Write a protein that holds these residues in place. Structure first.
Motif, short mmCIF file in Angstrom:
data_model
loop_
_atom_site.label_atom_id
_atom_site.label_comp_id
_atom_site.label_asym_id
_atom_site.label_seq_id
_atom_site.Cartn_x
_atom_site.Cartn_y
_atom_site.Cartn_z
N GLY A 180 -42.79 -10.34 24.16
CA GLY A 180 -42.73 -11.73 24.56
C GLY A 180 -43.85 -12.20 25.48
N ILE A 181 -44.83 -11.35 25.79
CA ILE A 181 -45.86 -11.76 26.74
C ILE A 181 -46.69 -12.89 26.16
CG2 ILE A 181 -47.82 -11.05 28.10
CD1 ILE A 181 -46.55 -8.08 27.66
N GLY A 182 -47.03 -12.80 24.87
CA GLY A 182 -47.69 -13.89 24.17
C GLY A 182 -49.16 -14.02 24.50
N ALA A 183 -49.77 -15.05 23.91
CA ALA A 183 -51.16 -15.42 24.20
C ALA A 183 -51.20 -16.14 25.55
CB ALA A 183 -51.74 -16.28 23.09
N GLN A 184 -51.04 -15.34 26.61
CA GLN A 184 -51.24 -15.72 28.01
C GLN A 184 -50.01 -16.36 28.66
OE1 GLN A 184 -54.91 -17.80 28.81
NE2 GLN A 184 -56.14 -16.51 27.41
N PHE A 185 -49.20 -17.12 27.92
CA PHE A 185 -48.13 -17.87 28.58
C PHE A 185 -46.82 -17.78 27.81
CE2 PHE A 185 -52.08 -19.78 30.13
CZ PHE A 185 -51.88 -19.71 31.50
N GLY A 186 -46.50 -16.60 27.26
CA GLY A 186 -45.22 -16.39 26.61
C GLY A 186 -45.25 -16.65 25.12
N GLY A 187 -44.71 -15.72 24.33
CA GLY A 187 -44.73 -15.88 22.89
C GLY A 187 -44.95 -14.58 22.13
N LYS A 188 -45.56 -14.69 20.95
CA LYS A 188 -45.71 -13.57 20.02
C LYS A 188 -47.12 -12.97 20.03
CE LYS A 188 -45.33 -12.54 15.01
NZ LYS A 188 -45.00 -13.11 13.68
N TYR A 189 -48.13 -13.69 20.52
CA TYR A 189 -49.49 -13.27 20.21
C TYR A 189 -50.20 -12.62 21.40
CZ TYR A 189 -49.36 -14.55 15.46
OH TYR A 189 -49.06 -14.57 14.11
N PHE A 190 -49.52 -11.65 22.02
CA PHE A 190 -50.15 -10.78 23.00
C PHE A 190 -51.36 -10.04 22.42
CE2 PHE A 190 -49.92 -6.73 25.57
CZ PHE A 190 -50.31 -7.30 26.77
N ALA A 191 -51.33 -9.73 21.12
CA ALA A 191 -52.36 -8.90 20.50
C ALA A 191 -52.84 -9.49 19.17
CB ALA A 191 -51.83 -7.48 20.27
N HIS A 192 -54.16 -9.49 18.97
CA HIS A 192 -54.75 -9.76 17.65
C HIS A 192 -54.41 -8.64 16.68
CE1 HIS A 192 -57.16 -13.28 18.52
NE2 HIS A 192 -57.86 -12.67 19.48
N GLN A 193 -54.61 -7.39 17.11
CA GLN A 193 -54.60 -6.23 16.23
C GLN A 193 -54.68 -4.99 17.12
OE1 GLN A 193 -58.04 -5.93 13.59
NE2 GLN A 193 -59.49 -6.31 15.27
N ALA A 194 -54.36 -3.85 16.53
CA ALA A 194 -54.33 -2.61 17.28
C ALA A 194 -55.13 -1.54 16.56
CB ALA A 194 -52.87 -2.11 17.48
N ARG A 195 -55.74 -0.66 17.35
CA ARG A 195 -56.41 0.53 16.84
C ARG A 195 -55.85 1.73 17.58
NH1 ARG A 195 -57.26 -2.75 13.75
NH2 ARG A 195 -59.21 -3.42 12.75
N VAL A 196 -55.41 2.74 16.84
CA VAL A 196 -54.87 3.97 17.43
C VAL A 196 -55.63 5.15 16.85
CG1 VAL A 196 -52.90 5.48 17.67
CG2 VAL A 196 -52.58 3.01 17.89
N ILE A 197 -56.25 5.95 17.73
CA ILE A 197 -57.00 7.13 17.32
C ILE A 197 -56.37 8.37 17.95
CG2 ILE A 197 -59.23 8.30 17.36
CD1 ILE A 197 -60.55 5.54 17.34
N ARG A 198 -56.07 9.36 17.12
CA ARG A 198 -55.57 10.65 17.57
C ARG A 198 -56.72 11.64 17.59
NH1 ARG A 198 -53.46 14.84 19.52
NH2 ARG A 198 -51.26 15.35 19.05
N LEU A 199 -56.88 12.33 18.71
CA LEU A 199 -57.97 13.26 18.93
C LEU A 199 -57.45 14.67 19.17
CD1 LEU A 199 -60.34 11.14 21.24
CD2 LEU A 199 -60.43 11.46 18.76
N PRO A 200 -58.27 15.69 18.91
CA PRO A 200 -57.90 17.05 19.32
C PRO A 200 -57.83 17.15 20.84
CG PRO A 200 -60.23 16.95 18.76
CD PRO A 200 -59.63 15.63 18.35
N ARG A 201 -57.20 18.23 21.31
CA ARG A 201 -57.01 18.41 22.74
C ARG A 201 -56.97 19.89 23.07
NH1 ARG A 201 -51.74 19.42 24.52
NH2 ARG A 201 -50.14 19.74 22.88
N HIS A 202 -57.47 20.22 24.27
CA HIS A 202 -57.17 21.51 24.87
C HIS A 202 -55.65 21.65 24.98
CE1 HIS A 202 -56.78 24.73 27.80
NE2 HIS A 202 -58.08 24.93 27.84
N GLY A 203 -55.14 22.84 24.67
CA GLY A 203 -53.70 23.07 24.66
C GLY A 203 -53.00 22.74 25.96
#
Ligand code: SF4
Ligand code: SF4
Lengths: 531, 534
Positions: free
Chosen positions: A285-308
């Motif tokens: 509900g955060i929205g485009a600055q003042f409440g609503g649906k458009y907090f985000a245009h789009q999302a990118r999620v990248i999974r990387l290797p890691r030290h154990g």
């Protein structure tokens, strides 16, 4: 047996998915040669100056399609709130102004960042940093931009460098004979919303990760002018590698990564979790600055290797001033990404008189609840980070809170340079939360009763405004060019001129829109969505 | 007018202050040529394999002088605590064992990180990443190290890559015709203590900054095996630039930077604030792991330019497994930093409760209950070994209705994992891991009758203190870091008990003798870090 596997294996490593324009006549800056049986490229380093100059000019007046498409989506979606549509409409109109090539889209014309990849057999003469910096210097000097870099003379004594240098110049050695670039004009507001977390195996299950995402997205708030491009990086070989990756992800630089992992630990984009991030962003509900649906245009999620033993996590956004440009130099000349030059194709309150004693303004604002849209007419005094610090220091030495902090609402902002014949350069609000530690102090000393900026604020500001009869008004964040063109009629430097954009200003405004975010009664427009 | 100023302006850009050895005969890998009037160097990429192989072998057995001198200072300083001297002596003795070239100084042989700077006219054929990766692969495959990298098959399904690849390869384009390197074998424990803060101008005054430093140093705790090399970076052009800088600062890579700023925003080292970090570290009383003065070997403070709206801050340490090596390839061949091959010269020229673990666990709990936190114990007998993945697997079993396995209730639980076993040895390097990562399991496991006594390193969260008080439990702190001497002297037998598919993170049953530890959390609500890490 040994098998080499690069961490990043984009299917489009050269960004063929991007449209480029060639700089006319730029084939004169390059020459293909053959040394010791291999193809090489001689590049006159002046090409780096020409390219950087153009990249850091164009990027302030035009946007990418995926950015403009998101603003149109917020306008057209029946499920968007009225505030979603109003903010997105304002930002698109701002982009139409910026595309006139005079005013930049935001007053914060950013840090100049260059990611360069110089082939083994691409020969520039080696002075790449100097020649790139001269092109950056040209762009910020000869256009109506801003000088945003602060040099440390000692640990605490600072001055503006006056030319937006130094740049961040990350030049990598890679195979071949070309020179490939990503230029970023990175606003400080979104740079400040790059976060590093040190996590454990306990995060790595669906329930924990979704709760983590919900928690951390709220800490972004509205402080970096959403709708956001949200980037999330899970894993990495070091903290600095995780943070570099999340920056590039937010620039959509890694969009062509594989979408599955393997036993060699290759990086991958995760569409399933990008969709989860978008669901969290929308349902927040955060929205485009003042409440609503458009907090985000789009999302990118990248999974990387890691030290154990390690699980670094990076979270970062690209803000409304979404500014990056791909480019490359090859045997045919200088090529630069083509941005959208006609943003208009994407386009489908209580009057408050400030020209009175401030107590009369406070009284009128007190009649209305948080969420009320207001239009301000009259004088604003402009002051942000350094001016606030100087003024606290004056009072700590026993001096009075200056008169100009007590007569008018305080606009946290700074201007870009003024175009010839114009009343103001681009002049939008800065992030209010950076001034939170001053509010109770200034109000207890008789000033800063009304502040005007963008972003959600901490609870101490809500408590101060309730204790002292104060108000915090939220301007739309990002639309610096239309605010300058339509609302700001006169600009005068009031104090600390050596501070550049961070001087104290006196400005006269008309029809300046804002929302009552914090009232004088303990209420906060963000208390439900950003609790 | 335009004036170019590089952010980083070291007075010793090629590290002439570092001693280098030439790889014998390595001039055969390079050839000087001239093309288009410019001097260039052709480098056979096999040189990168050779160089990376030697770097990631040498660094696990030898240390730099400044690291070893820090341990000697902790032994010889009258202001060092008794525990300071004990810990520093143990770590020096560990380094003497590692210098035998068989056992690595730590069981966590690290992530392989390469910072490379390839000159414009240094021509390798361009396959640098593969050739460097093959050298790293050789080092971890053919020596008694560990394979520490975890591949993500999907977001949550994981496996070990089995060869300590992928490496972090940051190859930069720079002027000239040489190839310069910094190799880092970065332990996970200190990698986890690299922190980024997003601050403001309100921080940038002496009172606020000092208070900030005091607050943040405590969040490092003892979790990354101090004495630390502490690096603090104030400012930066981006979060990633700030964090790269603090990493390199912790490796002492920026020691020759200017010590004053200028109107062009150049980076500088700040000796005054380095002195303040050291004062804060020393007066904290946190000490070299168990109370005292030697929380920190030394400090590096770098001040960077910043966007006016921004103030990123980085804080990072190098741990007891302080492992980096400089190197370069030029017209004369391959040169690699000379580390100290005789650490014993740093040891000086010239009181604990015996705990028999081969009794019922409730008798061991009863004996430990007689003593206050801070008591130094010597453990003899069986430990059950389990850390991150085994704990997660066991909790997963319990979530599916299974009981806590019996082998989690018979002996104290040692959070640790071994490096590969040298031929003829009972164990490879086998020191403790960071206890805090297992904090979420303690109350649950103790409520089901096990994990009453745990043994690892690092301060733990309050939930562990409360669990031990509720359930009559204890947390014992091993010295952190001395993996080689623990393996050579204390660990007598290692057998895999469960989850063999987990590799290093299987459940092990090990027999130990004269294994030293401190009672960190008792069964009464007391925690020996409660005053210094409050
Ligand atoms: S004001 Fe908003 S849009 Fe402009 S740079 Fe700052 S965060 Fe980005
Ligand atoms: S166990 Fe300690 S010394 Fe070894 S890598 Fe981890 S933090 Fe460093």
């Amino acid at each position: 047996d040994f098998h080499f596997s690069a961490i990043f294996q984009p299917t489009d490593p050269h960004h063929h998915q991007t449209e480029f324009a060639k700089v006319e006549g730029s084939e004169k800056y390059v020459e293909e040669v053959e040394v010791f049986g291999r193809q090489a490229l001689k590049v006159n380093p002046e090409a780096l100056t020409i390219l950087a100059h153009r990249a850091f000019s164009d990027v302030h007046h035009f946007f990418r399609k995926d950015h403009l498409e998101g603003w149109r989506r917020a306008i057209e979606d029946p499920e968007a709130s009225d505030n979603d549509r109003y903010v997105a409409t304002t930002l698109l109109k701002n982009a139409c102004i910026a595309a006139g090539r005079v005013l930049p889209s935001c007053q914060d014309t950013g840090t100049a960042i260059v990611l360069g990849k110089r082939g083994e057999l691409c020969w520039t003469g080696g002075e790449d940093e100097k020649y790139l910096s001269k092109g950056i210097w040209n762009a910020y000097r000869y256009h109506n931009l801003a000088y945003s870099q602060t040099a440390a003379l000692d640990m605490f004594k600072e001055c503006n460098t006056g030319d937006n240098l130094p740049a961040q110049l990350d030049l990598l050695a890679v195979p071949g004979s070309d020179y490939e670039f990503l230029f970023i004009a990175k606003g400080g507001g979104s740079a400040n919303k790059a976060y590093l977390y040190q996590e454990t195996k306990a995060l790595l299950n669906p329930k924990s990760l979704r709760a983590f995402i919900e928690e951390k997205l709220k800490t972004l708030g509205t402080a970096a002018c959403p709708p956001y491009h949200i980037a999330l990086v899970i894993g990495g070989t070091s903290a600095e590698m995780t943070m570099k990756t999340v920056k590039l992800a937010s620039c959509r630089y890694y969009d062509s990564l594989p979408t599955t992992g393997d036993k060699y630990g290759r990086a991958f984009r995760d569409p399933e979790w990008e969709k989860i991030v978008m669901e969290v962003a929308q349902k927040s509900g955060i929205g485009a600055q003042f409440g609503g649906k458009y907090f985000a245009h789009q999302a990118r999620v990248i999974r990387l290797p890691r030290h154990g033993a390690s699980c670094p996590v990076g979270l970062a956004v690209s803000c409304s001033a979404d500014r990056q440009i791909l480019a490359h130099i090859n045997k045919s000349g200088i090529y630069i990404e083509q941005l959208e030059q006609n943003p208009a194709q994407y386009l489908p309150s209580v009057k408050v008189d400030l020209k009175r004693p401030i107590d009369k303004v406070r009284q009128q604002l007190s009649q209305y609840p948080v969420g009320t849209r207001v239009m301000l007419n009259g004088t604003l005094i402009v002051a942000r980070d350094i001016a606030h610090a100087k003024i606290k220091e004056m009072m700590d030495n026993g001096e009075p809170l200056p008169e100009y902090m007590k007569t008018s609402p305080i606009y946290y902002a700074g201007p870009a340079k003024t175009p010839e014949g114009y009343a103001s350069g681009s002049f939008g609000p800065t992030t209010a939360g950076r001034m939170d530690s001053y509010v109770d102090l200034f109000q207890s000393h008789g000033g800063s009763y009304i502040t005007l900026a963008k972003g959600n604020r901490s609870k101490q500001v809500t408590d101060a405004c309730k204790k002292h009869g104060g108000f915090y008004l939220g301007s739309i964040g990002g639309p610096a060019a239309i605010l300058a063109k339509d609302s700001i009629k006169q600009v005068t430097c009031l104090a600390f001129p050596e501070l550049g954009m961070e001087a104290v200003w006196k400005i006269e405004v008309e029809d300046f829109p804002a929302f009552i975010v914090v009232d004088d009664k303990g209420n906060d427009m963000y208390s439900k969505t950003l609790a």
